[PDB]
Amino acid sequence: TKGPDAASKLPLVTPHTQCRLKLLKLERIKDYLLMEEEFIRNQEQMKPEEERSKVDDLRGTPMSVGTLEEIIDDNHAIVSTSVGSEHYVSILSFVDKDLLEPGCSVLLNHKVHAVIGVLMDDTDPLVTVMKVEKAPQETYADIGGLDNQIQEIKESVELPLTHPEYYEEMGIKPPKGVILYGPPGTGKTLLAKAVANQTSATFLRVVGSELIQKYLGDGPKLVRELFRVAEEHAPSIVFIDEIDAIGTKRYDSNSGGEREIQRTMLELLNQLDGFDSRGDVKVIMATNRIETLDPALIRPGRIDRKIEFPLPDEKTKKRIFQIHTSRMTLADDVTLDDLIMAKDDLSGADIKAICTEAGLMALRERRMKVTNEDFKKSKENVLYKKQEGTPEGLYL
Amino acid sequence: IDINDVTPNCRVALRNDSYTLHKILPNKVDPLVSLMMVEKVPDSTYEMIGGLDKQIKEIKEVIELPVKHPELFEALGIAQPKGVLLYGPPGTGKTLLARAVAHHTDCTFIRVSGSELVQKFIGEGARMVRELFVMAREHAPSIIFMDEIDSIGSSRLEGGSGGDSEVQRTMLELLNQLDGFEATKNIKVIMATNRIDILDSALLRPGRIDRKIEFPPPNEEARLDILKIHSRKMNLTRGINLRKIAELMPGASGAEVKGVCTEAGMYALRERRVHVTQEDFEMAVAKVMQKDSEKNMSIKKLWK
Amino acid sequence: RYDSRTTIFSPEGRLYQVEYAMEAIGHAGTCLGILANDGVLLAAERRNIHKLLDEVFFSEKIYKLNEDMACSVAGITSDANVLTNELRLIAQRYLLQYQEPIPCEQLVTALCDIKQAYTQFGGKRPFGVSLLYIGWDKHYGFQLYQSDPSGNYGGWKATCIGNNSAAAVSMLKQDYKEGEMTLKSALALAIKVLNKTMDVSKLSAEKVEIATLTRENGKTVIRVLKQKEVEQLIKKHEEEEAKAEREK
Amino acid sequence: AXXXXXXXXXX
Amino acid sequence: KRFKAGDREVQRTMLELLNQLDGFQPNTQVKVIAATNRVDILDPALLRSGRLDRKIEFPMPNEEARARIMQIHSRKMNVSPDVNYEELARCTDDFNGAQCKAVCVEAGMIALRRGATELTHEDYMEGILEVQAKKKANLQYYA
Amino acid sequence: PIRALDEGDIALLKTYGQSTYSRQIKQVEDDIQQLLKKINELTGIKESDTGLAPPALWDLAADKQTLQSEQPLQVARCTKIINADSEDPKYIINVKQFAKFVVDLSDQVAPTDIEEGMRVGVDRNKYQIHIPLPPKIDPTVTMMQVEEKPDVTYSDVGGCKEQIEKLREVVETPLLHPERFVNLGIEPPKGVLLFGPPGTGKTLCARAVANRTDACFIRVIGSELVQKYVGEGARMVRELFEMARTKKACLIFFDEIDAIGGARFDDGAGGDNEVQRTMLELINQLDNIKVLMATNRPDTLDPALMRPGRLDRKIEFSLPDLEGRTHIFKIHARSMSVERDIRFELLARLCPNSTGAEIRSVCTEAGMFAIRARRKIATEKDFLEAVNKVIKSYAKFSATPRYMTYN
Amino acid sequence: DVLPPEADSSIMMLTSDQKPDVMYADIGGMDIQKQEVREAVELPLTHFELYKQIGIDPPRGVLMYGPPGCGKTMLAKAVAHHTTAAFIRVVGSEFVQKYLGEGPRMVRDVFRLAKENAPAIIFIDEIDAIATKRFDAQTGADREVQRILLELLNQMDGFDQNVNVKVIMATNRADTLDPALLRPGRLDRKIEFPLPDRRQKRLIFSTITSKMNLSEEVDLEDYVARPDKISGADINSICQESGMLAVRENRYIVLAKDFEKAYKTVIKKDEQEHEFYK
Amino acid sequence: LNQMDGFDTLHRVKMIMATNRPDTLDPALLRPGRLDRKIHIDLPNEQARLDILKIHAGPITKHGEIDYEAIVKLSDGFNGADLRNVCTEAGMFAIRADHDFVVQEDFMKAVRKVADSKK
Numbered sequence A: 001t002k003g004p005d006a007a008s009k010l011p012l013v014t015p016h017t018q019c020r021l022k023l024l025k026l027e028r029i030k031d032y033l034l035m036e037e038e039f040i041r042n043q044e045q046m047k048p049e050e051e052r053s054k055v056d057d058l059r060g061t062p063m064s065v066g067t068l069e070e071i072i073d074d075n076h077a078i079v080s081t082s083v084g085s086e087h088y089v090s091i092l093s094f095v096d097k098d099l100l101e102p103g104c105s106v107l108l109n110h111k112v113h114a115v116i117g118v119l120m121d122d123t124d125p126l127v128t129v130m131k132v133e134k135a136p137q138e139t140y141a142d143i144g145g146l147d148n149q150i151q152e153i154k155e156s157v158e159l160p161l162t163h164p165e166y167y168e169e170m171g172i173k174p175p176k177g178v179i180l181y182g183p184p185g186t187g188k189t190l191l192a193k194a195v196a197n198q199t200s201a202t203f204l205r206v207v208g209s210e211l212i213q214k215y216l217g218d219g220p221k222l223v224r225e226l227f228r229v230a231e232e233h234a235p236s237i238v239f240i241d242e243i244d245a246i247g248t249k250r251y252d253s254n255s256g257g258e259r260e261i262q263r264t265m266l267e268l269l270n271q272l273d274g275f276d277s278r279g280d281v282k283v284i285m286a287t288n289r290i291e292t293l294d295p296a297l298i299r300p301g302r303i304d305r306k307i308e309f310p311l312p313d314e315k316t317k318k319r320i321f322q323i324h325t326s327r328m329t330l331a332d333d334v335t336l337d338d339l340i341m342a343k344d345d346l347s348g349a350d351i352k353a354i355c356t357e358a359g360l361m362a363l364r365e366r367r368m369k370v371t372n373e374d375f376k377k378s379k380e381n382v383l384y385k386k387q388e389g390t391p392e393g394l395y396l
Numbered sequence B: 001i002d003i004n005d006v007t008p009n010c011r012v013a014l015r016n017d018s019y020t021l022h023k024i025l026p027n028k029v030d031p032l033v034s035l036m037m038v039e040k041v042p043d044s045t046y047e048m049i050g051g052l053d054k055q056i057k058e059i060k061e062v063i064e065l066p067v068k069h070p071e072l073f074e075a076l077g078i079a080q081p082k083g084v085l086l087y088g089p090p091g092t093g094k095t096l097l098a099r100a101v102a103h104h105t106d107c108t109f110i111r112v113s114g115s116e117l118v119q120k121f122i123g124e125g126a127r128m129v130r131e132l133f134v135m136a137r138e139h140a141p142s143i144i145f146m147d148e149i150d151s152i153g154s155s156r157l158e159g160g161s162g163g164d165s166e167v168q169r170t171m172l173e174l175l176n177q178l179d180g181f182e183a184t185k186n187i188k189v190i191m192a193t194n195r196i197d198i199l200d201s202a203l204l205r206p207g208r209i210d211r212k213i214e215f216p217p218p219n220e221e222a223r224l225d226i227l228k229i230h231s232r233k234m235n236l237t238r239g240i241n242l243r244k245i246a247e248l249m250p251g252a253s254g255a256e257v258k259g260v261c262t263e264a265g266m267y268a269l270r271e272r273r274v275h276v277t278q279e280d281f282e283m284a285v286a287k288v289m290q291k292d293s294e295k296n297m298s299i300k301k302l303w304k
Numbered sequence C: 001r002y003d004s005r006t007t008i009f010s011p012e013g014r015l016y017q018v019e020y021a022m023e024a025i026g027h028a029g030t031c032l033g034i035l036a037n038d039g040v041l042l043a044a045e046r047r048n049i050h051k052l053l054d055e056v057f058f059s060e061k062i063y064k065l066n067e068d069m070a071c072s073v074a075g076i077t078s079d080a081n082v083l084t085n086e087l088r089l090i091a092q093r094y095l096l097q098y099q100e101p102i103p104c105e106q107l108v109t110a111l112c113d114i115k116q117a118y119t120q121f122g123g124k125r126p127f128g129v130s131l132l133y134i135g136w137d138k139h140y141g142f143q144l145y146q147s148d149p150s151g152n153y154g155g156w157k158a159t160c161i162g163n164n165s166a167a168a169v170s171m172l173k174q175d176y177k178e179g180e181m182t183l184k185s186a187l188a189l190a191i192k193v194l195n196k197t198m199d200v201s202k203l204s205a206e207k208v209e210i211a212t213l214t215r216e217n218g219k220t221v222i223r224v225l226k227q228k229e230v231e232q233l234i235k236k237h238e239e240e241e242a243k244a245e246r247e248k
Numbered sequence D: 001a002x003x004x005x006x007x008x009x010x011x
Numbered sequence E: 001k002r003f004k005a006g007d008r009e010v011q012r013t014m015l016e017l018l019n020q021l022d023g024f025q026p027n028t029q030v031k032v033i034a035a036t037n038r039v040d041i042l043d044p045a046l047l048r049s050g051r052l053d054r055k056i057e058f059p060m061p062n063e064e065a066r067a068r069i070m071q072i073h074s075r076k077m078n079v080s081p082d083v084n085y086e087e088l089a090r091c092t093d094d095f096n097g098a099q100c101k102a103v104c105v106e107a108g109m110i111a112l113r114r115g116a117t118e119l120t121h122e123d124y125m126e127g128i129l130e131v132q133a134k135k136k137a138n139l140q141y142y143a
Numbered sequence F: 001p002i003r004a005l006d007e008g009d010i011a012l013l014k015t016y017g018q019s020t021y022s023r024q025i026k027q028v029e030d031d032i033q034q035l036l037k038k039i040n041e042l043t044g045i046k047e048s049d050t051g052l053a054p055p056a057l058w059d060l061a062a063d064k065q066t067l068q069s070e071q072p073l074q075v076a077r078c079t080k081i082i083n084a085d086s087e088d089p090k091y092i093i094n095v096k097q098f099a100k101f102v103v104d105l106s107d108q109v110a111p112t113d114i115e116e117g118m119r120v121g122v123d124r125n126k127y128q129i130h131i132p133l134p135p136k137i138d139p140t141v142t143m144m145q146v147e148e149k150p151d152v153t154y155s156d157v158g159g160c161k162e163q164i165e166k167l168r169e170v171v172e173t174p175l176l177h178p179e180r181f182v183n184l185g186i187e188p189p190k191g192v193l194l195f196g197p198p199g200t201g202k203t204l205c206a207r208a209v210a211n212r213t214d215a216c217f218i219r220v221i222g223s224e225l226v227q228k229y230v231g232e233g234a235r236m237v238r239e240l241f242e243m244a245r246t247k248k249a250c251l252i253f254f255d256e257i258d259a260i261g262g263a264r265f266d267d268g269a270g271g272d273n274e275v276q277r278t279m280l281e282l283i284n285q286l287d288n289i290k291v292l293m294a295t296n297r298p299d300t301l302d303p304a305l306m307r308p309g310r311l312d313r314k315i316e317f318s319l320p321d322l323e324g325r326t327h328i329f330k331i332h333a334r335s336m337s338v339e340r341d342i343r344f345e346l347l348a349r350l351c352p353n354s355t356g357a358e359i360r361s362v363c364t365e366a367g368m369f370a371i372r373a374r375r376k377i378a379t380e381k382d383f384l385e386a387v388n389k390v391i392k393s394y395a396k397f398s399a400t401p402r403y404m405t406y407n
Numbered sequence G: 001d002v003l004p005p006e007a008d009s010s011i012m013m014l015t016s017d018q019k020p021d022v023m024y025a026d027i028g029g030m031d032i033q034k035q036e037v038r039e040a041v042e043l044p045l046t047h048f049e050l051y052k053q054i055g056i057d058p059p060r061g062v063l064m065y066g067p068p069g070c071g072k073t074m075l076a077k078a079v080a081h082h083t084t085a086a087f088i089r090v091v092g093s094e095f096v097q098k099y100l101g102e103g104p105r106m107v108r109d110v111f112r113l114a115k116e117n118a119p120a121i122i123f124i125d126e127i128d129a130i131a132t133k134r135f136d137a138q139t140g141a142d143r144e145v146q147r148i149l150l151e152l153l154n155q156m157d158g159f160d161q162n163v164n165v166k167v168i169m170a171t172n173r174a175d176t177l178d179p180a181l182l183r184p185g186r187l188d189r190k191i192e193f194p195l196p197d198r199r200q201k202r203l204i205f206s207t208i209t210s211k212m213n214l215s216e217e218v219d220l221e222d223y224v225a226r227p228d229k230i231s232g233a234d235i236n237s238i239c240q241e242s243g244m245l246a247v248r249e250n251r252y253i254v255l256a257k258d259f260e261k262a263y264k265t266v267i268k269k270d271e272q273e274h275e276f277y278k
Numbered sequence H: 001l002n003q004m005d006g007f008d009t010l011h012r013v014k015m016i017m018a019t020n021r022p023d024t025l026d027p028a029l030l031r032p033g034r035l036d037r038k039i040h041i042d043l044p045n046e047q048a049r050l051d052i053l054k055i056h057a058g059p060i061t062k063h064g065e066i067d068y069e070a071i072v073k074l075s076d077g078f079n080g081a082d083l084r085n086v087c088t089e090a091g092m093f094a095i096r097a098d099h100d101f102v103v104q105e106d107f108m109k110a111v112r113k114v115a116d117s118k119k
């Protein structure tokens, strides 16, 4: 357990009004940053052998990496070369006959194959990029409304790590695995990007299409790797966004290609709740269509809390507006209620386009102050792709 | 070599015998996801695009303005519009406004058109789009222009025996790449389609396709302009009223208008001339702008 | 999908077949009736105007139901005949039973129930015919009624159905006239609306069809203006059109 | 009915 | 049937077998017999002239056959002398012979849970419900 | 008339009205970002130690010796013994991927030590059999067997007493008392294929059988049996079953059989048939070794693999009846901090047609309602609020306006 | 060294030994149609100076449509024997390959092959298989037929404009085709091949028979006047089988008797009917 | 249809596409150089039964005389494929009985076996 390799977030500078309080706080972050660079650089310069040097001479360069398969004697193991062959190499003294485990990736001498070192942390480049290093920059205060949905997603991924006493003092096991579903543009991924900017646990991410490799076993083996790293790195959250790509309803497909995707779902379906129960690895799926996921992948036990994200309500839509018109410069005549009240199913991604557009309709008239007409026009210009589709005047 | 330059996923070159690293080498982009990068800018310029003086201006607030001068948006406090969906009846200029934005862009203009991301091997369509938005970031600012988006992004059908499930998994990638967990900086998409109702609602939600620019069939003052941009090189006689030809062509697509110009010129090459008269046109506005009738009174009076 | 029978309710509660039917009216010819005091008019379009077609009725789209009731049609030809047949039979029964003309609205309700009744019992296809009604009564005088395939009706001051209903209905709004709806203004607008609603310009007289209903000495003459007067009508609008170009 | 099919690649 | 994919190894195996089958003529003491449960996927080449051409047809057994089939797999058990195997066949339809054995094996088990030695007729019937996973519940509306 | 922003226009928009700290502040933010980028690179490379042993346990002088005298030996298999004269055997050895060679022993080995078929070590140069090797113990298969007994006991599996009893007569009873299955001569079903709606207790009745095994329980992953290289799927199937016959009282549990048990179909133009030939190497294998299988979707299994010649017994895990749901509840609530009184019988009738797991989330959500509001005792009122969110909230629409028809 | 590329016949680029061998005079009549095709797929390669002198870029596609058996493919078989470009024939069904992403890629390989070996003519015969009006697809099959038409549309007139790659297309329906693939720019000239009138039938008869040995009493004008609406194959038929009747009787000269025996076999096409559809 | 009357190469190969239902076949398929000659092959000719049996019967040793005529009416509407079996199935009857066919009594039952059991 290497511990949570949490993201690296620089502190936050607020005020945002671009006031001197802002400059000073950025300077303070810069000052320590300049200071911190000083120590790193001044540590190599200020900083100005006969035991390891002998070891590196026995190893030589380069050093192959094959898979250990059997420890025949204490000083002999069979190592399979990187091509799938086998070899009855010799186990030298410097290697630790403890870390040497069947399945471990062993460093092999190049000329005379002989175990020389055990290469832990051999996680694929395809799953070591899945780890979020630079934390996203959208804090829970950037998400407006969704207080009922946020709390549901904060009692499975944040609270169970800060106040564990509550849950274990009551007999629950903290809910682990939440399916964020709802219409497109409601905030599913933003709430996810917000748990990464608050959590202190390794936040692996996927896109539900990354874990479908072409090779027959490349697929199910990347998932078995991702949940090996998430478990390895202690507190972790695996965010499989757009889960609909891999986990759709199983069916008797007459196409081998489609029988390998399902052979990857039936791995994510067993790497979550199957024999040999999990450790501490929460999973946050997202999907705009919960009506096509397999009844098993969202069966209570793997996805315990199905957070439903409806289109914004009138009160939320008014809070959504301010979070995106916080940095804008509205004139005194910009009374947002004229646009919010409409019965148009204005999603939360629509609201940020009625903000980008109403700010660009301002440059049209050469104004950095958006008046009230700049929103009326923008609402129409931003509200297509949905036109108007409904019944005729049948119902009274 | 300073080890600080060896980031994961580099393409270092190793010596022939002792396997020592001795160069970082240019980074690897799949052989097929690299032909998609425009190396030869087309030769369609804005002055050849008539009638679309509004759309060309609405499309520069997303392709050009946010890239050239981002400081305007930052101070104004509004995010940068990202994508544009140029829909409209076929033959209006949707792929003409695109070749134009490629002749004046000073921004790597990648071109993924139709079924170029639909690969037989599963999990390869998703890979190409991954490497396409990586070659569009290391070379940013960039403009991905995906023509015929109906091919890869039609509404997501229920997974079953018969249903697009691999062009779907690559749709759910582009869907995530544009507005996903990882924000994208300085990449813009100019999808161009004909049917705008058959795309999935995630691909027409603001945040991925901000402006949805419509390209309607040209009006009379638009057909006239089109008839003048494609007959500029023609040896027009005197008395060749390009407006009367235009007035003879109601709802004429816009690429058909050029068909009158190629056909009006084709009626001359069969006669070995270089000058195209009016009757050479009016006799050609009937050929190119031809129609099919119901050719049945039985069906045609079904509806009173 | 739940569009197999006219009696199946979609999960959202929409009788799809009725949406499919009334939406079907779009393929039909355009009929409009304008606002008018002391009158109201119907203007239809003869969609099929081929040459070899002998004109014998002159009223392919405007029917006279009662001595003081006229209704156009926009929809299926077969269903239009059966509804116009059932309409008249309903109106004349009312005259026989009450020895008093059927007061307009009760004519629409009688037909609307017949049309709606199809939208309830299975095995009968929803009447795909909307039809404008104009007329007069002793109760409210000149009235306009817009029937729908889904049975729902409604009084109207100016409406258009069928092809380009949207364009006609909006413009009838754009220059919508309340109170000041003299017949002459109605005629000018009616041809005026057909000018853009009807794709083919010049509103060639034979390609248009106007029938007006007036209360003359308590006789209620229902008129179907002949080509000659339309020509001058089209000319009357035609002359007015040129004077508008002076702006340039 | 008519079924289009994808495919993997046994290395 | 057939299908550079990685099945160009089994294809060599078939053509090899295809080769030898036609290699030797009849009149020999090398009579061949091959068994398949899905004969709609076999190559037509495998069954043309000098290869397995006289094809043996194995049906899903009939009712009389099922009564017999359920007997052979019951001899080694102490089934009661009053077990109308015929009646069992009537209740046992669309049953492949193997399933016809499953009833026998299940019949013995069902007796076990009940702590009996001889398998009564009822035990056999309970097998005919548990061989197909059905769970017999006394539904009320019958009486 | 969307006038394009003239260069004269741009200059003013960006300077007129600017807050005097704008250029400076935006400078500070830009400085930080580049500064952070440089900061990582100077330290981003973190040493990944390579598993060297403590300095005390080194023999570096002798280590140079092993690398110098001892030589790498390719591991091969003797496929035949020609026994040319019974005095010059001329063994044929398979180098796995390299090739098949007719080799002869180095003098060190004994002619009688290399028996046909046993793994034999060869020399890179001439391929003379230098040393015999122990039979192959698969690195993956060996890890498969559940070395740590799962903690779930049989008292945690509720509402499936007749389904557990049916399993105990195939997986436990014929393995602890092989005398009731002999007296009547009934052949023990040597495999059951647990099927049921997802989340009814298939894998819990699997871990439960593991906690009381007395056998060697092998948990077949499903993923590992589908390998990239052709054939390596079947090679694993054999090396698992082979690892069972060697053990006494071995149980194999193929969880999620759908992975490698799909109905066959000719797709040879692709790697799918690779997986299918791995099942046909499992169908042959199946038909003291008991086999279990779990499949939430049995209909996708090959008819051949569900016949009563391979899977003699098919236990159906149905949705619990009421007398079992009140029992599934008490099993998961025995550790909850509930108020003594809870009418669990009542909570069983509010979860109609609910699986054995959604009963669990009702117990897990019940507390979460007791944690949201700071009550350390999860009272009954919470559960009804729980059954509204876990079961009802996702059951159906069936709402008041459309439910005022039922009274 | 840079070895010469290899794109000789990847998609059946017509080799010097696959010339169809049908001269223009062998095709009969089709005077108007031949010129329209000869004006977009043959002339521009040779006389490109004439096109640029008038300011019109030469038409780039032709879509020969008309009733089946009327000689559409023949004009194409010819243009191949008479072309200095690289004819590349591809039938419509050749794109419908299974393995989604193999069909659409075939289109992207045809226009790549033609682009490299330019100028070239790509003739997609029986285009009605892959270019039927796009009715919204709701299954993974009509979706992959639509991915082919769109990949067809995108290379013909798309962001990557090709130089000197003319496309000849032939279809027997001419209305089922998607409106985007009939828009003046992709398939510019929509030549029609109508059933031979009383005149083209004469020219057709004079070219099929001018090689056959006809006995002097065979007045081909006795059969070219019969009102029946025979098609071009039927005229080739009424002649190819006419001689086969002569060959059976071992006679080395087709006589007038056979043509009438032949003429009643290639035109009684009802036969079956059922008499109740009339 | 294309691969027949098709640009590529006209070729010298021939096709014998045989159907069971000629009304179904599309018109283009029956043309001069695109598949001609609608040769009809009805159930074995009345006299053929003899010839077919003649060509398919003699091989199997059978000294006994043959009343072929009765076998002909004993086998009306016979598919001919059945006739091949008739003699062969008779050989199985002979394979039991003894080793030499010396009786038509064999074909009679053989005719039945290749009728009721061939239904």
Ligand SMILES: Nc1ncnc2c1ncn2[C@@H]1O[C@H](COP(=O)(O)OP(=O)(O)OP(=O)(O)O)[C@@H](O)[C@H]1O
Pocket: A142, A143, A144, A145, A146, A183, A184, A185, A186, A187, A188, A189, A190, A191, A287, A288, A320, A323, A348, A349, A352, B179, B180, B202, B205, B207
């Ligand atoms: N409730 C909200 N409050 C504030 N911003 C919101 C809200 N909902 C959505 N947004 C805005 O939506 C933008 C993008 O939407 P988001 O990423 O949340 O969608 P999503 O759930 O991932 O959608 P999809 O189904 O397309 O994947 C964010 O930048 C965020 O500002």
Ligand SMILES: Nc1ncnc2c1ncn2[C@@H]1O[C@H](COP(=O)(O)OP(=O)(O)OP(=O)(O)O)[C@@H](O)[C@H]1O
Pocket: B048, B049, B050, B051, B052, B090, B091, B092, B093, B094, B095, B096, B097, B147, B148, B192, B193, B226, B229, B254, B255, B256, B258, G153, G157, G158, G180, G185
């Ligand atoms: N307004 C216009 N002015 C000049 N040329 C135009 C105009 N509209 C269309 N064209 C011409 O019509 C031809 C048709 O190609 P165009 O770029 O219009 O593609 P499209 O049909 O709009 O879209 P797609 O290629 O995706 O089907 C081009 O040569 C284009 O220049």
Ligand SMILES: Nc1ncnc2c1ncn2[C@@H]1O[C@H](COP(=O)(O)OP(=O)(O)OP(=O)(O)O)[C@@H](O)[C@H]1O
Pocket: A269, A273, A274, A296, A299, A301, F156, F157, F158, F159, F160, F197, F198, F199, F200, F201, F202, F203, F204, F205, F294, F295, F296, F328, F331, F355, F356, F357, F360
């Ligand atoms: N009937 C039940 N009784 C008790 N606990 C149950 C029951 N059903 C599910 N559970 C709980 O759920 C866990 C796992 O559920 P289960 O074993 O049914 O999964 P599964 O059937 O393998 O699902 P899938 O078939 O989709 O993989 C159990 O360990 C237990 O905690």
Ligand SMILES: Nc1ncnc2c1ncn2[C@@H]1O[C@H](COP(=O)(O)OP(=O)(O)O)[C@@H](O)[C@H]1O
Pocket: G026, G027, G028, G029, G030, G068, G069, G070, G071, G072, G073, G074, G125, G170, G172, G204, G231, G232, G233, G236, H005
């Ligand atoms: N005008 C003609 N001149 C010569 N042969 C013709 C003519 N019209 C038809 N034919 C005959 O019919 C064929 C025409 O091919 P056709 O059926 O039109 O092809 P497709 O249907 O693929 O376009 C020629 O090969 C020739 O045998």
Ligand SMILES: [Mg+2]
Pocket: A188, A189, A241, A242, A286, B176, B179, B180, B181
């Ligand atoms: Mg998302």
Ligand SMILES: [Mg+2]
Pocket: A274, A275, F202, F203, F255, F256, F294
């Ligand atoms: Mg399980």
Ligand SMILES: [Mg+2]
Pocket: G072, G073, G074, G125, H005, H006, H007
């Ligand atoms: Mg042809």
